[PDB]
Amino acid sequence: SGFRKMAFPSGKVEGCMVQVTCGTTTLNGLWLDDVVYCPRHVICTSEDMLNPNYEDLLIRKSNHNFLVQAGNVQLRVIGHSMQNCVLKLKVDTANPKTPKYKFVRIQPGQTFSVLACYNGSPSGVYQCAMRPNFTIKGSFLNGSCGSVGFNIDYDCVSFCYMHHMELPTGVHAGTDLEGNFYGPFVDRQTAQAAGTDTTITVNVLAWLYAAVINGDRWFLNRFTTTLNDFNLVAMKYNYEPLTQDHVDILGPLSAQTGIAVLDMCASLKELLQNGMNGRTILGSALLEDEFTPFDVVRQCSGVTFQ
Amino acid sequence: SGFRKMAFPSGKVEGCMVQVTCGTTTLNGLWLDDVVYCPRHVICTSEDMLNPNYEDLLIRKSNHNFLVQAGNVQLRVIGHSMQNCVLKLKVDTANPKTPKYKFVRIQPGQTFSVLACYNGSPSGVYQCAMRPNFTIKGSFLNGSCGSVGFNIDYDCVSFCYMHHMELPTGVHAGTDLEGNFYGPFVDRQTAQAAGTDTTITVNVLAWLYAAVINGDRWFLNRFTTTLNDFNLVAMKYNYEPLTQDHVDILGPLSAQTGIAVLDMCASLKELLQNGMNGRTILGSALLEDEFTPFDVVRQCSGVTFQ
Numbered sequence: 001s002g003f004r005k006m007a008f009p010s011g012k013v014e015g016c017m018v019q020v021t022c023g024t025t026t027l028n029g030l031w032l033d034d035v036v037y038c039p040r041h042v043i044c045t046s047e048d049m050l051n052p053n054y055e056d057l058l059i060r061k062s063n064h065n066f067l068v069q070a071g072n073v074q075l076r077v078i079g080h081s082m083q084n085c086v087l088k089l090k091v092d093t094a095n096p097k098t099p100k101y102k103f104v105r106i107q108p109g110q111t112f113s114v115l116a117c118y119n120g121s122p123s124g125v126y127q128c129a130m131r132p133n134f135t136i137k138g139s140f141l142n143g144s145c146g147s148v149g150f151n152i153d154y155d156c157v158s159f160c161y162m163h164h165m166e167l168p169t170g171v172h173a174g175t176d177l178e179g180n181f182y183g184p185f186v187d188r189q190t191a192q193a194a195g196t197d198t199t200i201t202v203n204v205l206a207w208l209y210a211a212v213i214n215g216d217r218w219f220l221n222r223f224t225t226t227l228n229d230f231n232l233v234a235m236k237y238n239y240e241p242l243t244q245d246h247v248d249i250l251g252p253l254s255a256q257t258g259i260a261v262l263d264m265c266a267s268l269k270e271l272l273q274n275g276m277n278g279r280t281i282l283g284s285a286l287l288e289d290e291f292t293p294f295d296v297v298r299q300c301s302g303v304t305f306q
Numbered sequence: 307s308g309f310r311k312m313a314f315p316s317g318k319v320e321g322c323m324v325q326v327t328c329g330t331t332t333l334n335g336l337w338l339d340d341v342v343y344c345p346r347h348v349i350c351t352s353e354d355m356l357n358p359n360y361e362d363l364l365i366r367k368s369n370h371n372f373l374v375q376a377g378n379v380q381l382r383v384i385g386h387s388m389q390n391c392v393l394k395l396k397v398d399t400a401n402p403k404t405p406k407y408k409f410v411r412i413q414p415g416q417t418f419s420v421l422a423c424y425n426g427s428p429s430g431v432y433q434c435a436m437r438p439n440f441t442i443k444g445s446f447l448n449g450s451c452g453s454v455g456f457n458i459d460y461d462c463v464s465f466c467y468m469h470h471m472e473l474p475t476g477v478h479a480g481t482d483l484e485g486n487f488y489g490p491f492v493d494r495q496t497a498q499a500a501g502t503d504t505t506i507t508v509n510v511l512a513w514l515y516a517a518v519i520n521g522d523r524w525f526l527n528r529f530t531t532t533l534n535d536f537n538l539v540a541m542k543y544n545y546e547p548l549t550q551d552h553v554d555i556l557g558p559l560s561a562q563t564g565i566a567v568l569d570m571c572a573s574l575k576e577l578l579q580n581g582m583n584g585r586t587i588l589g590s591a592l593l594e595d596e597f598t599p600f601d602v603v604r605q606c607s608g609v610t611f612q
């Protein structure tokens with residue numbers, strides 16, 4: 001038993017991280033087969049950040065403007081191109097530690113692990129969710145651009161995020177691995193801000209189920225509600241509305257605890273309207289929304305990976 | 307002068323459309339180089355639509371289960387694979403009419419052209435916008451799946467949309483060409499609905515500028531407002547908030563008409579609070595939000611394509 005913010009083991013990703021230097025700018029790249037992927041703003045200088053013209057900036061570069069280091073070994077760049085907001089650097093050596101992988105775009109509310117890196121060197125791993133406003137509340141310092149987010153499905157690494165920038169409010173924005181931004185952000189220095197965030201309701205319910213599984217039951221009650229009566233209350237507290245598909249997804253947790261989804265919604269309704277009254281749930285005094293139903297099952301039933 | 311809902315010329319795309327049959331199900335595919343792209347639900351039957359397991363359904367198929375027709379010529383399938391929600395069928399012949407192309411993911415509020423097709427045969431072209439709730443208000447009948455949306459930048463076709471399904475409200479949902487859905491939709495038959503839509507404010511302003519350029523001036527006034535006072539009123543009418551980046555984007559239209567953006571916002575504020583009073587703007591009695599600032603410049607200044 002117990003319940004922790006658990007990340008995926010990062011070994012398979014650590015062996016793909018490299019350092020990319022162009023001019024005086026260094027950041028992290030992802031080396032898979034014979035291609036290194038990195039944020040295209042590595043080709044920018046100080047004068048270019050405001051209104052960069054990336055097609056111009058790129059035609060003015062040659063392969064030898066790009067220094068790529070895999071630890072000590074130097075990787076020779078034999079070609080380069082742009083795909084949306086990422087740069088693809090073809091190199092002469094295919095990464096022998098390339099895992100089975102795919103590129104996937106995730107949806108708001110889904111979670112992933114982040115391998116934070118500096119100078120091509122992995123520094124730490126942590127779990128976060130893609131927020132409904134398409135930002136992540138990460139932890140990133142200067143030099144972390146090109147760090148990646150990922151999930152592991154069996155033997156296969158699904159890459160879903162590459163880090164590009166920090167917004168003024170201290171939250172983080174990036175792209176999928178095809179270079180398409182999450183959210184309405186652009187890789188230049190303008191006055192862009194995240195829109196208002198909401199709480200991920202299906203995740204809060206999954207976490208309440210984890211609590212019951214681990215022996216926290218004080219918030220339960222005998223009442224029941226309907227989808228439309230719950231969603232009416234959720235709107236007022238900036239909670240995402242609850243769909244029939246969400247109810248279906250919570251099925252395995254309903255089954256294991258014998259507490260129906262709409263039964264648990266009535267407990268959530270009470271918690272939103274009266275607060276927690278100085279009591280905690282799984283060691284928290286706030287309702288937690290960064291665990292999916294799948295995260296909970298994985299941690300409260302047990303699935304490993306190859 | 308004049309102002310019409312204008313689509314891009316479709317010739318370069320018409321030559322890429324093919325018909326894909328698997329079993330008793332036929333729909334449209336996109337044939338570029340030696341790959342045919344189509345919705346993966348072509349491999350589903352009636353019993354599978356509710357809860358398909360696509361990895362299972364695909365392993366049970368072989369190359370000869372897939373009939374691909376380019377007009378009269380038959381294309382031999384020599385391999386197949388899945389990328390997210392699209393099927394990639396490798397064929398023995400590279401399309402000689404493959405244009406210069408790229409795959410791009412668009413943002414809510416951007417417009418594109420749709421080439422509606424049936425049985426691999428192009429039927430019509432029309433312009434639409436990606437709505438803020440990630441649906442499009444298309445026009446599609448049975449058999450239109452795999453029809454694509456695109457923009458043309460100079461000589462290059464940017465594919466941004468492939469059609470997968472119609473929602474219960476009569477609006478349409480699909481993926482980018484890497485197979486990732488726009489919006490929180492899945493390719494199975496569940497009870498999914500679009501969230502609430504909003505009006506694309508920067509597009510309404512661009513259209514008011516087109517009106518001034520074409521001689522409709524009755525809605526202008528001498529007042530001015532601030533970004534925050536406008537956005538306060540826009541919230542109440544379900545209009546997207548206006549950013550500084552939006553103001554910058556409208557620059558060329560401000561310059562050509564000599565009417566400042568915040569000046570035009572005050573006219574919009576009046577129109578929202580008092581209505582149009584039986585008058586029309588560019589032949590419409592409603593405020594139109596499916597023209598971008600770029601669409602207006604293109605039509606009210608003139609850019610061609612190769």
Ligand SMILES: O=C(c1cc(=O)[nH]c(=O)[nH]1)N1CCN(c2ccc(Cl)c(C(F)(F)F)c2)CC1
Nearest residue numbers: 041049140141142143144145165166187188189
């Ligand atoms: O390494 C970090 C960092 C990341 C982080 O998350 N937090 C933090 O403090 N620092 N940099 C390096 C430089 N970056 C940057 C460079 C050029 C451009 Cl054009 C842009 C763009 F956003 F405008 F596209 C960004 C932003 C911050």
Ligand SMILES: O=C(c1cc(=O)[nH]c(=O)[nH]1)N1CCN(c2ccc(Cl)c(C(F)(F)F)c2)CC1
Nearest residue numbers: 347355446447448449450451471472493494495
């Ligand atoms: O051709 C049309 C059509 C499109 C349109 O836009 N309007 C219209 O009337 N008909 N079909 C064909 C069959 N389609 C379908 C088949 C299997 C699956 Cl699994 C799914 C999925 F959505 F569940 F993934 C959809 C939906 C409607």
